Each structure stands twice: as structure tokens, then as C-alpha cells.
RNA sequence: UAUAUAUAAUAAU
């Protein structure tokens, strides 16, 4: 469970979904997984999407080059969770 | 130096720093603490960093049970990040018609050391639907009791289930 | 079916 590997996109309006995110993040190299959902039950999360990168390699260059930048109401966060 | 900072846990979604301190400085002396709960902005994770200058206050603080809002707080000395991630949590379904956390916590206490376990109650929020929670410092015990989904409890079996991770 | 955390995370069943 390293300190960087995935990116969490939370404060993001329906303006940019899996299509825009798929490149707002990838904007550096290859990615791996991309997921987008809202808060149908929680009733809180508006635009949440999980973007897993190739690994500390692409994540190093991506999260380091881009992780939290003027986007939406909050800046993308450096994720790390990994799924076997 | 080796010990002094703590990780207040189970904080009620309604606590302040000066308030949390005035409450804690009842044991010894404290130099600083970083509480997150912010009733003014709205709400935040319920935890609190207590920078106890005298490592002792930490020993009695974690070795003592207290109730700020009267809900349920869990004070523990700072815990290693890797140890926190290793800890696993399982959610228990179904429970006796009138079981108190005394047993439950003692119940699971046998196998798999219980780092943070307990039964929830409507008092905590109002969802006394009938459930339970258990936390071990490892996932090995989880998979261990896992094969034992339904377990014989007081009078009603308990359906064990992962805290959420279907795995 | 439900959970108050290491200052951050959607869905499901």
C-alpha cells in the first residue's frame, strides 16, 4: 500500500465525466482503471471518480506532475488504494 | 519523545479543540492538540491528535474510558500507519434481542485479539436495527472466523460479514 | 442490513 498509485476525483461537476477525466489525469502517460459515480444513496458525493494509474511509475509522473490543481471546488487528490 | 502524541478516536460529530482540551487536561498537562471536528463548517472525521507533553497522560488516557458527548470515544496512543492499515474490521449481522456491548466485546475478545470492537445502539445515532462491529490488528483472524459466518451467540446466532470489502 | 478517523474517496447488495 504505497503513498501514490491512484487518483481520487471528488469535487467535479457533471461537466467532466469518464471521458474528460480519462484524459485530465492520463495527461502524462498511460492509465489503468477509471470509474465514475454520484451519491444516489449517500446523497453527498456529487461527481466522484477513481482513476488507477499503471503504478508508482505512471503515478509518480502523473501524481507528481498533476495531483491537486485548480479543478472543480477541490483539487484532485493523490490516491493509492490498489485492487488485486 | 518516543510517546506523547495520541489519536483520539470515536469523537462525537460535535467537539471543539479548546473544548476537547479542557476535557482532556483533567489527567495531566497538554501542550497542543489538533482536533478536526468542525461544527462551524459542518462536519469532519471524528478524531483528535492529542500532543500530551507528559508521555504519562497518554498511558492513563488510553488506559481509561471517558465520554465527552456521552456517545462513545476511543482514545489510543498514536498508532503506526502500517499497523493501522493492517488492522481489519468486520461487520456482525443479527444479535440477541437485548445484548449489551459488555459481552459482545468480551465475546469476540477470545479468538483474534479485539483492538476495536463494539455493538452499535440507537443512542449512537438511532439505527438499533440489530448489528455489531469487530476490529482485529490483522486480517488473518477475519478470514479465520470468516469460515464461521453464523456464530452461536447469547440466544440469536450472529451472521458475520466483512465490514464492507466483499473480497 | 450497518459503521464517526489518521486532516481525502463514488458505486454495490
Curated annotation (Swiss-Prot), chain A:
Where does the RRM domain start and stop, copy by copy?
5-83
Residue ranges that the Swiss-Prot or TrEMBL entry lists as coiled coil = none
Where does it localize? Nucleus
What superkingdom heads the lineage?
Eukaryota
Further comment: Present with 6350 molecules/cell in log phase SD medium.
Q: How does it assemble?
A: Component of the CFIA complex, which is composed of RNA14, RNA15, PCF11 and CLP1. Interacts directly with RNA14. Interacts with polyadenylate-binding protein PAB1.
According to its UniProt entry, what is the function of this protein?
RNA-binding component of the cleavage factor IA (CFIA) complex, which is involved in the endonucleolytic cleavage during polyadenylation-dependent pre-mRNA 3'-end formation and cooperates with the cleavage factor NAB4/CFIB and the cleavage and polyadenylation factor (CPF) complex. Binds to A-rich RNA sequence elements.
* Name of protein: mRNA 3'-end-processing protein RNA15
Output the lineage of the source organism: Eukaryota, Fungi, Dikarya, Ascomycota, Saccharomycotina
Gene that encodes the chain: RNA15
| Full protein segment contained here | 14 to 97 of 296
From Swiss-Prot, chain B:
- Any one of the GO BP annotations: response to DNA damage checkpoint signaling
Which top-rank group of organisms is this from? Eukaryota
Q: Where is the RRM domain?
A: 4-86, 88-165
Q: Name one GO cellular component term.
A: cytoplasmic stress granule
Sorted alphabetically, which keywords does the UniProt record give? Answer: Cytoplasm, Methylation, mRNA processing, Nonsense-mediated mRNA decay, Nucleus, Phosphoprotein, Repeat, RNA-binding
Q: How is it modified after translation?
A: Methylated by HMT1. The methylation is required for nuclear export.
* Residues modified as Phosphoserine: 51
According to the UniProt entry, its GO molecular function terms are: mRNA binding; RNA binding
**What compartments host this protein?**
Cytoplasm; Nucleus; Cytoplasm, Stress granule
- Has keyword RNA-binding? yes
Q: What does this protein do?
A: RNA-binding protein, which is involved in the polyadenylation-dependent pre-mRNA 3'-end formation and cooperates with the cleavage factor CFIA complex and the cleavage and polyadenylation factor (CPF) complex. May be involved in regulation of poly(A) site selection. Is involved in nonsense-mediated mRNA decay. Seems to bind to an RNA downstream sequence element (DSE) located 3' of a nonsense codon and may mark the transcript for decay.
Q: How does it assemble?
A: Interacts with NAM7.
Protein name from the UniProt record: Nuclear polyadenylated RNA-binding protein 4
According to its UniProt entry, this protein's organism is Saccharomyces cerevisiae (strain ATCC 204508 / S288c) (Baker's yeast)
